C-alpha cells in the first residue's frame, strides 16, 4: 500500500463476481478497470505502447509522441508519456468527450482538434500529417499496432485466470479497436481452447453486417474489421441496443453501487444474453472499461 | 483479487510518498482516498454511520435514513444504505455539487432540495423537520455524531501507521465537519504523543479568526467549531488561499498524474508550508479526500 508513483496502481484490478440474477443459474464476473489511476483500462494500453516504442528504438528522450484518440487512450497514453518525460500531442475530434479532453490536458498533453464530422478517421489523418512535420516523432497508432492487444495479453488476461474460481466458459468484451478482446481472448484460448470468445458491438456497427450509424454507447464501435481478430477464434458477435446498455448502467448503480460506463452496460447486457444460450452453471468473464463519472455531463443515468 | 461486493473495496487505500520537492529535505505522504468505490473518503463514513446506527438500536430494516449533505457524504451513505436495503432521503442545497447529486440519485437515494442561500444549515433544519414527519427514521447527523471521527480512528488511522516507513512528525488534514482530522489525529497521537496535529482550512473560515466568505475550495470549510476537536491536541491551524490549493491540483496532475480535488490541493499546500517550519528530514502525512474528476464541470483545472 505504500507507493511512490500512480503507475504502481495500474493493473491488478478487481474481478467482481456480480451478485445479480443470471440466466440458467450461471455466473458473470467483471474486471473493474475503472479502478486504474487513469480511470480506465487504457492506463494499461498507454504504458505498453510507449514501452514497445522504446524497445523498438522508435522513441528517444526528445521524441514527440503523436496519437489520434477519441477518448480514454489519450488519458492512458498521457499518463505513460509523462512518466517517461516524453512530449505529447493528442489529436482528437473537436467536440468528442469533453471531460476526457480536460484530463488529457491536465496530464500535460497538448491537444490538436480535427472536425467532428470526420471522426477518428480525420484525427488519424491529421496525426499522420503532423508526424510528417516533426522529424523526431512517433505515432503509436493504436488501431493497427499489435502492441495494443499485446498490452492486455500479458497483464489483464493472466490476472483473470489468477482470480477465477472456475474454468472460463466464455469471455465477453466490447470492441472499439478490438485490442482488449483480441488480446485477452487469445491468451485465454491459448490456455484453454474450450473457452468461447464473444465480441460485443454497440448500435450501428458493421462487425455484424449491421447498419453504420451513430450510437449512444461511448467507447466501442468498429468502422473496419480490427486486424487483431486474427489471433482469436471468435465464436459469436453480439449486437447490443443502447437501451439495454444504459439500463444495465442504471441497474448496477442502483442495486450494487457499481458506477460503470455505457460500454460496460453493453458488455453486461451481452453477457446476460449469452447466459441464456450457454449450459447452466456456466462461468462468463467480461470487462468494464471505465466509469460513469466520466459521462455525468452526458446525462448517462437519465432517461 | 476476487470480490463479490463493491464494499470490499472500501478502505486500505494507498499511502503515497509524494515524489515532489519538499522544503528542508522532508517527506510528504498522502492517503489517496479517491480510490474508494464511491470516489471519496466518505465511503468510510457512510458505512460506519450506518453500522453505528444499527448497533445503537436506532435503525431497523424498515427505517428511513435521512441526512443533510452538501457533497460526498451523500454518496458514501447511499452506498452503505444500499448494502443494508435501507430507504434513503438526502437533503441537499439546490445547486450544490451537480455531479455528486447525479451519483446520489444513481445509488438509489431520494433527494429533497433546500434553498442554496441557506447552505448546509438549511439542509440540516429540513432534515430534522422531515425526520419529525416520519416515525421510523434516523438522522445520522454527521456534523454532531461522534461516530464520524470514530469511522477514521479505527480504519484510516491504523492504515497510515501500517504503511509509514518512519515515525510521523506531523499529521495534516482539511476540516469540513472536522471528522477526518479529529479521528485520525486522536489515533495517531494516542500511538505517539510527539505527533503534531495540524488543521487546514480554506480562506474564509472562523477556525483561524478569519472573516466569513465563500471560497473556491469545495468540500472543506468550517462554520462553527467542530465538537470533535476535544480529542486532539491541535498544534496549529493553517489557512490556505484558493490560489494555492488549485495550483497544487494543476501541478500534481501535470507532473505526477495525480487527479486530486481542490481540498486535496489545499492539504498539500498546507503540508508544504508546514515543512518550511519543521525540522529537516521530517515526515508529514496528509489526506487527499477525493478526485478532481468530480469537479470537471466546475473548471477545476482552469485558470
From TrEMBL, chains A, B:
It is an enzyme of class 2 (transferase). One of its GO terms (molecular function) is cysteine synthase activity. Its cofactor is pyridoxal 5'-phosphate. GO terms for biological process: cysteine biosynthetic process from serine. It catalyses: O-acetyl-L-serine + hydrogen sulfide = L-cysteine + acetate. Keywords: Amino-acid biosynthesis, Cysteine biosynthesis, Lyase, Pyridoxal phosphate, Transferase. Its EC number is 2.5.1.47. Residues 7-290 form the Tryptophan synthase beta chain-like PALP domain. Pfam families: PALP. Belongs to the cysteine synthase/cystathionine beta-synthase family. This is cysteine synthase. It comes from Lactiplantibacillus plantarum (strain ATCC BAA-793 / NCIMB 8826 / WCFS1).
Amino acid at each position: 500500500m505504500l507507493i511512490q508513483h500512480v503507475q504502481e496502481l495500474i493493473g491488478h484490478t478487481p474481478l467482481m463476481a456480480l451478485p445479480i440474477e443470471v440466466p440458467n443459474h450461471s455466473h458473470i464476473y467483471a474486471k473493474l478497470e475503472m479502478f486504474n489511476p487513469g480511470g480506465s483500462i487504457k492506463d494499461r494500453l498507454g504504458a505498453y505502447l510507449i514501452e514497445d516504442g522504446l524497445q523498438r528504438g522508435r522513441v528517444n528522450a526528445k521524441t514527440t509522441i503523436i496519437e489520434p484518440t477519441a477518448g480514454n487512450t489519450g488519458i492512458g497514453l498521457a499518463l505513460a508519456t509523462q512518466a517517461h518525460h516524453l512530449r505529447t500531442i493528442l489529436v482528437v475530434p473537436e467536440k468528442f468527450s469533453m471531460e476526457k479532453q480536460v484530463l488529457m490536458q491536465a496530464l500535460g498533453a497538448e491537444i490538436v482538434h480535427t472536425p467532428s464530422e470526420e471522426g477518428i478517421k480525420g484525427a488519424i489523418r491529421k496525426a499522420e500529417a503532423l508526424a510528417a512535420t516533426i522529424s523526431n516523432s512517433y505515432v503509436p497508432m493504436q488501431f493497427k499496432n499489435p502492441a495494443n492487444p499485446a498490452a492486455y495479453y500479458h497483464t489483464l488476461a493472466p490476472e483473470i485466470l489468477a482470480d477465477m474460481p472456475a474454468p472460463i466458459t466464455a469471455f465477453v468484451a466490447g470492441a472499439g479497436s478490438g485490442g482488449t478482446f483480441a488480446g485477452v481472448a487469445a491468451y485465454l484460448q491459448a490456455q484453454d481452447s474450450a473457452t468461447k470468445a464473444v465480441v460485443v458491438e454497440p448500435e450501428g456497427s458493421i462487425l455484424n453486417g449491421g447498419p453504420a450509424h451513430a450510437h449512444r454507447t461511448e467507447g466501442i464501435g468498429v468502422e473496419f474489421i480490427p486486424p487483431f481478430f486474427d489471433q482469436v477464434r471468435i465464436d459469436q458477435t453480439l449486437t447490443i441496443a443502447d437501451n439495454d446498455a444504459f439500463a444495465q448502467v442504471r441497474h448496477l448503480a442502483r442495486d450494487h453501487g457499481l458506477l460503470i460506463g455505457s460500454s460496460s452496460g453493453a458488455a453486461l447486457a451481452a453477457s446476460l444474453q449469452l447466459a441464456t444460450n450457454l449450459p447452466a452453471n456456466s462461468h462468463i468473464v467480461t470487462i468494464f472499461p471505465d466509469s460513469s463519472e466520466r459521462y455525468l455531463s452526458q446525462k448517462i443515468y437519465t432517461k
